[PDB]
């Protein structure tokens, strides 16, 4: 069919109309004051939520061109939950802020670039005072607290992820499962970790989780392109003899390999995930090397000379348990032994000494890193199987906070943080009254969290972000007990690189859309 | 009967549609290469015209806000008419730059009562600034060059203006009527100068011209307000019994004693037209006396005793000639004799000896330079009736726009004055952001007539006027020969009173247009 | 009340619309061989005529903006028609040309002023070319000629005008009656013509004629303004007695003067017809004087003493016969003794050996032409009085093709004239492109009214013109016997003043109308 | 050749002066002298700044002077090193010519139903 274009003022005011829409109706639940937001369910009793994603996935406009603006705000909303797991409420109010005021200063005439670039200068010194004033979360009894504010005052959760934190290290991996007994359970086992996803959506057994969960699978390595599926048909015969989860690993999976394998899925006799190789040549041979010695596997190469027909049920790897997220994939418990394990870490060690160049040298390092470390596993202990679920969400989430904290650092939350720099950064000015204006534009929405925190809360919003402009520090205004004080103080805290993540795509994404004049569109039938 | 109202941003918006279409409709006519604009009579053809002040006259609109508008702005540019005399183009080409920015800074929210203050101030200095380049025009050689330039390069016109200014003085009385022959004859002859108005519009015998001109009137002279008219059936018999034109001073003239005299004139049996009485209590007596003194007249008051109805036609003044303009009233050759007029210049003299109040002396001053002074008469002198007329009407514009540089000054026209004091004011900064805001919208308006002017020469009006800020002093773009040069050298001058009158008019006219939100109106029927 | 503005070139196709519809319904009676026209008459049969006025006249649009088109082209037409007497349609085709082409080029985006200013060049040049082309018409045998084609190849009519035009020279007057005998009437009989026109078209007594004819009238002479009409009431009732038509001199008529004599004339009891004075000061009473010597009448002035209210029956002029025009009056065999004409005669005579100013000099010498050479006096000579009226319409319209063609010259007719000027001019350029294009455009709108003549024919309007343009000197295409020739030997002949004028009236306005942008209007109600 | 469009806007400098068998062929040229200014002025015009008041800049300069668009200053783009092949250039001033050439003398535009 045909299409249909609109540009001027007319799509910038038809994108603000859609990016109000999305916005209220995701801010509506900011803050722990946030009001519940009823969502569709097209069978039985509609869903009851207070997460930004959960409605923010929901919503597109019946209009193309609102549907167009709530779709990019949306994106950049879900790009800072993937890149942060939180504060999506927060990224989206700010973005509507920018861009509410940057049209409006566009309708005014303002030079559009111009006032991009000022954005741009003023969120990058925002930025840079957000790292200034982070503070360090290193210490473990920051991490538990941090632990506890983000699993609903749970001082279980965030204590386990401590204790698996100083097990596995600074930057080592914790992995949630399902306990039998009441008692919580730590475990510290030799694990793989690689940042690679699946090659479709539709691999995922659980969508409320987002992950491929594969309890005793048999793992295939291999580092070639899977060009035709008669290469996967005996290690489809012989999983389908055994009866087993599989997972493979090769380098490139093509649509219609991949597309197989979405119609055995949706057939489910065979229970298949698949992931990119992941590292780049050499290294990423070595490193699936160092997969095959922990699972016991073998590396299917061309130049080598073996292929994926010729493949047995010794041949492929295997592990108790193995978790393919959205981008990354997790294996623990492999089969293959210790002592070749320590071989491999001694190997690579040598590799270490030998280098030379600096990032094959990291390469390396990361390399005995993960090969050595292992992954540690919190097993949820408590009496019911409800509780197993919600307190696994828990664990999950704040453990996301938890990394996030420990990666950057942690300030106080509740929205003071931006309220702060932006105090701290009222003297900037840009090369020009345009630039200048921008940066008010960034100064003044950085504002915006906590005006529509306080409004959830149902106090005046000018009052409040008035009385907190005038404390400086830490000092801040609880809205959990409606009271003011040190955020420090009440435990709000909030890690300092979702903030910056937040802001950043929030600032990243106006600067586009205030540069945005064709609005073409599909012709609305 | 029941009204709508309309408020806010919607209201300023059908405003500002009204003051664009008046505008348009107006600058057309811009410059001396503005473009024809033809206005309907209704009957017959319809007449064309490049007169700023005809065609704002003429506009009118057919939904009620957009009218408002449209009204507003003709007021405003009615009242710079009467102020100068010329330039309403210009007041309204920058009322309209002033009305547009101004409401386009505060749809983006910008506070319109600091845009006031900072349009205010801008203009302030503006103002002054202009009076800083200011150039006089008291020599007789620049009143003759203005008085050609004006009158459509007619030496003989400012000549004949320069003749004159020398013959009644620096603030002398100039009356131009027909003369006979086909030489242009200068006299000088006692006269009178009052700045009243008449009471009606109806009293106007020539509504093109726009005064009552009558010819050997009988002058009735009353300190007493005409509370009925059969105080006036005496005199209006008498009148009538004469078939002479009739002229009437009295402190107050009621709404019913006019109304009986708007019949009397729509009948026409008598030529009645009527003014207040000039001045102020004593002073207005006294001078009264001088112009009972100056036409053989009497003063009636009921202080004295003596009324209206007790008149005989030896009692009534009479003179040669008399003219009421729109608010003043020139008499040339009164029959009182010259003997009793110098002696009543003594006694003034004398009363000026003995004052001791400030203004009451300028007052006495002032009657004694009217008194001894009198009128300088131009009688147009060619061989046709038509061209009577039009030189008449060029003599009349010729002289507003000479008596316009002798009050303040001369400045190079062309819109080069408000190019030269803009580019010597771009420095002006305000209280806060919003005052600096205001300051470039009034900087950025000054700019408009000569953008106006060089899009209806047909170039590129930013290029020019980008040439015009590069050049400094009265270095300009002359629209009739389209060549670039200094405007003193080709004669394009312009008082600075009209200039300044028309930036004061149409800054005070946007600036209060800015704070206007509701709009009342009348039902749409 | 509420108005329209539409501006931009919206109007400019909207009164070129106007101007095509007024253009083509006139255009169709161009022509020896133009196509009837019928029109309504609202009681009874519907006239039909070849007459371009009696079609422009009738034309007005239902829509206002192309009526405010067709009224200004109209207005230009009967401009033409009143200064010269024919050849409207050829005006109103040159006005169409010109304004097509030259809306056509600005909606090109061209200059609009500067194609008028190219216009106006290539008409200057086209005057002065048909002035260098014009031939004398001094001659009796030519001037014999063109009044036999004139009134429609009637040789008596054109030989009357001979006659005459030897009896009173020439610059003398000529004045047409209704003689008894079958044979044709010339007398001389010493008479008055002065430009002066009729205060209201109602005192007309023949629409059909445009002017007043009244026999044996009583005419008052007057040098002051009629105020009242009690000035006018006993000279209404001596004239009421007296029963016969009466003509008024007066320096000014008031509008209530006016509309009392306009009551009086639709009461119709008194037969009224008043006048300006001509002339201006000194010379209008002295000329005044002489019409009063004329008449046996007596000039009545403010400044000498007498009134209107004293006007005896003895004391008014009185005449065999006078004529109103539109703009001129005639007096035909006054009363008063040819010896005080022949005094006032000798008076004037030693004026114009005082007379030292050349203007005052050149009045004085066509005072004594006026007074001695008198009028001479055609009446028409046939069977019927159908003959009567039909003849004494040619003999009018060709007497004023007749002093057309002795004023300024006479070309050879049928659109050959403007085509030969056309072919002596395509050299001309402008000063730059947009001026050369406003010359193409008089250039190729100059051949217009041949083209439309031709195709009026039937033949082909381009084949022809192509023809006419091959021939050189007064070589042209005979519409009439619909062959080729030399356009002086069939007698097809123009005068050089008509096409002048049609040239330059239709030039000017369509200059004016080019620069037009704003068509302001009342409201379609 | 120096980029920014003011390759074009210096042929056509050089170029005023070319004139057509006829008036429509100046006319012709005419439209293609004045129709090589514009992707400078779309430039400018995305910039921010005045078009016309830039070209006009630019025209009155003369070799390889303009207006540099990244730092929005006056100079030579040889000096900061805005620089289009003129290969590239020509075959896009070439083909818009043909096309443009092509589609003025374009009359019948036949279509389907709109459907
Ligand atoms: N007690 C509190 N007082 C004040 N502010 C608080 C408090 N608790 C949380 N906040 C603030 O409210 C926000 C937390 O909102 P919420 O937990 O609903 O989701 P989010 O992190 O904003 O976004 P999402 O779940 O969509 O990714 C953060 O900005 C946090 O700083
Ligand atoms: N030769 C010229 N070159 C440049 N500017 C000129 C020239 N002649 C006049 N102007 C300018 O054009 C304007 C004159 O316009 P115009 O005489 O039509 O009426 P106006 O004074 O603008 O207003 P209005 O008649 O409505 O009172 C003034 O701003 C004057 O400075
Ligand atoms: N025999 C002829 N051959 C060619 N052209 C002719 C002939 N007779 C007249 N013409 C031309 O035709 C026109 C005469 O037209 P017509 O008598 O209908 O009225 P007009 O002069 O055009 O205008 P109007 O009557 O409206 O004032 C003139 O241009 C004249 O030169
Ligand atoms: N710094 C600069 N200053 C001025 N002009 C520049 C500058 N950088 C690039 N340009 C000009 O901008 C244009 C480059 O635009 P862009 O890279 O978006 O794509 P393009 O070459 O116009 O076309 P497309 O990508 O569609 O094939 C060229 O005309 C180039 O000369």
Redesign the interface.
């Known amino acids: 069919a045909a299409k249909d274009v609109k540009f001027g003022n007319d799509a910038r005011v038809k994108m603000l109309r859609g990016v109000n829409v999305l916005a209220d109706a995701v801010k509506v639940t900011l803050g722990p004051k946030g009001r519940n937001v009823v969502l569709d369910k097209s069978f039985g009793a509609p869903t009851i939520t207070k997460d930004g994603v959960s409605v923010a996935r929901e919503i597109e406009l019946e209009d193309k061109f609102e549907n167009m603006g709530a779709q990019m705000v949306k994106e950049v909303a879900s790009k800072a939950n993937d890149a942060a797991g939180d504060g999506t409420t927060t990224a989206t109010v700010l973005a509507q802020a920018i861009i509410t005021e940057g049209l409006?200063?566009v309708?005014?005439?303002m030079?559009?670039?111009?006032l991009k670039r000022g954005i741009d200068k003023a969120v990058t010194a925002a930025v840079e005072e957000l790292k200034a004033l982070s503070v360090p979360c290193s210490d473990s009894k920051a991490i538990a607290q941090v632990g506890t504010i983000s699993a609903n005052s749970d001082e279980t959760v965030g204590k386990l992820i401590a204790e698996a934190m100083d097990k596995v290290g600074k930057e080592g991996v914790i992995t949630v499962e399902d306990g039998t007994g009441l008692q919580d359970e730590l475990d510290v086992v030799e694990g793989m970790q690689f940042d690679r996803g699946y090659l479709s959506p539709y691999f995922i057994n659980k969508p409320e989780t987002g992950a491929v969960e594969l309890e005793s699978p048999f793992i295939l390595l291999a580092d070639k392109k899977i060009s035709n599926i008669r290469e996967m048909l005996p290690v489809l015969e012989a999983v389908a003899k055994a009866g087993k989860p599989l997972l493979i690993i090769a380098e490139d999976v093509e649509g219609e390999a991949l597309a197989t394998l979405v119609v055995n899925t949706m057939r489910g006799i065979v229970k298949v995930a698949a992931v990119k190789a992941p590292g780049f040549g050499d290294r990423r041979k070595a490193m699936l090397q160092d997969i095959a010695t922990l699972t016991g596997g073998t590396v299917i190469s061309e130049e080598i000379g073996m292929e994926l027909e010729k493949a047995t049920l010794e041949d492929l790897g295997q592990a108790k348990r193995v978790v393919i997220n959205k981008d990354t994939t997790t294996i623990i418990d492999g089969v293959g032994e210790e002592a070749a394990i320590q071989g491999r870490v001694a190997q690579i060690r040598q590799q270490i000494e030998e280098a030379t160049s600096d990032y094959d040298r990291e390469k390396l390092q990361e390399r005995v890193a993960k090969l050595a470390g292992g992954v540690a596993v919190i097993k949820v202990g408590a009496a019911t199987e409800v509780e197993m679920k919600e307190k696994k969400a828990r664990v999950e989430d704040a453990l996301h906070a938890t990394r996030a904290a420990v990666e950057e650092g942690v300030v106080a939350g509740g929205g003071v943080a931006l309220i702060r720099v932006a105090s701290k950064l009222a003297d900037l000015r840009g090369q020009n009254?345009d630039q200048n204006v921008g940066i008010?534009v960034a100064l003044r929405a950085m504002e915006a969290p906590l005006r529509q925190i306080v409004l959830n809360c149902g106090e005046e919003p000018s009052v409040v972000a008035n009385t907190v402009k005038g404390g400086d520090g830490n000092y801040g205004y609880n809205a959990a007990t409606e009271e003011y004080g040190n955020m420090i103080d009440m435990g709000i805290l909030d890690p300092t690189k979702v903030t910056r993540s937040a802001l950043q795509y929030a600032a990243s994404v106006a600067g586009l859309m205030i540069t945005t004049e064709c609005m073409v569109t599909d012709l609305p039938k």
């Open positions: 409006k200063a309708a005014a005439g030079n559009p670039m111009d009254e008010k």
